[PDB]
Amino acid sequence: SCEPTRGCPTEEGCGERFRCFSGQCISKSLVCNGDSDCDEDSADEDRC
């Protein structure tokens, strides 16, 4: 057991980036490119 003193670090800002199922935020230009755009999963897929 431990006493938390410092606050936990919040998640990174995903600014103007299509979020994937994991969290790998990449540029929006890769949407509907017909390939391994996110390189992790095809969750979003931009309905391409």
Binding site: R6, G7, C8, P9, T10, G13
Partner: protein, 49 residues
């Protein structure tokens, strides 16, 4: 500015801010619009406006 968060305020608060003539005298442009920062225990972010 400094705020206080508690269960009574439901973790929201608003503080008034002022922009006084502290800008550098002269220069090529006196705008230097703003750099806004937030000091919190769990998060920290900055943005220009």
């Amino acid at each position: 500015g400094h705020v206080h968060l508690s269960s009574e305020n439901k973790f929201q608060n608003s503080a008034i801010l002022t922009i006084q003539p502290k800008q550098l005298p002269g220069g090529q442009n006196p705008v230097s619009y703003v750099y806004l920062e937030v000091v919190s225990k769990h998060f920290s972010k900055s943005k220009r406006m």
